[PDB]
Amino acid sequence: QVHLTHFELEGLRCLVDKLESLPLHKKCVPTGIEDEDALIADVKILLEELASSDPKLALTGVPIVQWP
Amino acid sequence: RTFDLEEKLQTNKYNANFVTFMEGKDFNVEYIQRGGLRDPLIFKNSDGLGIKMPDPDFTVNDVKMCVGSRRMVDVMDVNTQKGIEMTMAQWTRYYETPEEEREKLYNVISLEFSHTRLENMVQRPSTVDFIDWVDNMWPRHLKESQTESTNAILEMQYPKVQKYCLMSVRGCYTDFHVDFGGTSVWYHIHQGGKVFWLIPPTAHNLELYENWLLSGKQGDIFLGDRVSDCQRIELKQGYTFVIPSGWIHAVYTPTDTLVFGGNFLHSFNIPMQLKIYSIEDRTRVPNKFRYPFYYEMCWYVLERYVYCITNRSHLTKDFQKESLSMDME
Amino acid sequence: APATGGVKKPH
């Protein structure tokens, strides 16, 4: 129930599909990431939930990802 | 070079209008959300961009003292477009050498000066800071840990591609290319000027570009003449130029010039960023000319999105604690 | 001869 842009929704989908489809020797899962499979699963759930984002309400003027 | 570069600078056939002319105050996050940063942008003045640059009469020698006289710098041989290396003192001597006494044409486009005294004298556009993956996705304690001011990969703790100094003598030319990893680029003409040829990242143009890379006939062919529409545009002193992901471009330097610019990935043009990475893969671009830790970064991007939206972390406990320590500062 | 990354150059 935050509203993302379609740019982000399509991009994150592209990212998920890309990363999931790489072989283990090309995946480059970084040291900081715990369980990449659980991460991928959570992204897919999120993209389903965010699919109905309203395009106008998405134009908040500040990014969703910001440091505290 | 098997083509005549001077006729490419004079002809009126590169008459496409791809570049949007914009005011700095309108280049904000809402603009990115609305447009996805798909259009090349020129800001004829810096008002509202939030940039900062060095002393207007800053010299290559001043750059040398900031980054270190003995720092090895990657230099381009303009005639072959191959890379050579020399120290910053030697580069400075070259730049200070009278034109007539320089037996070769050399260009520096790749001096990344983060973690030197020069870094605080250059501030990127504010909007770039809001959207750049390095600043907003890469673990902060890793980025803050960087001590090495060179781009030595074994010492590199994050993708060190944010702040570059370009030093180009009259007559320099950089042939058509797409910036690494499909990064977008900002470019500020501190002193001098530049001429760009721009080719849009259509499926067909990207196919041609890739075939051109694989053909071994690149010095032999001017890519601007192989495509349907190409824009040649001049950037004057004080202009800021933003180039979107995937844009195929070449650059000529009509006078001695000093430029500050940098690369960034962002969340609003991911498909094109990945497209470009795959072209690099297929054309066997060596690792050194690519965006460092590209897929690592992509992983961190997914984690950040899940965390900011759902409050569920996919970082290790130790990385979460490092992040909380940063938050308490 | 340390390996480098993020060198900007046409390929």
Ligand SMILES: O=C(O)CCC(=O)C(=O)O
């Ligand atoms: O200014 C130049 O010669 C080249 C700029 C550029 O497009 C690059 O270095 O990636």
Ligand code: NI
């Ligand atoms: Ni470039």
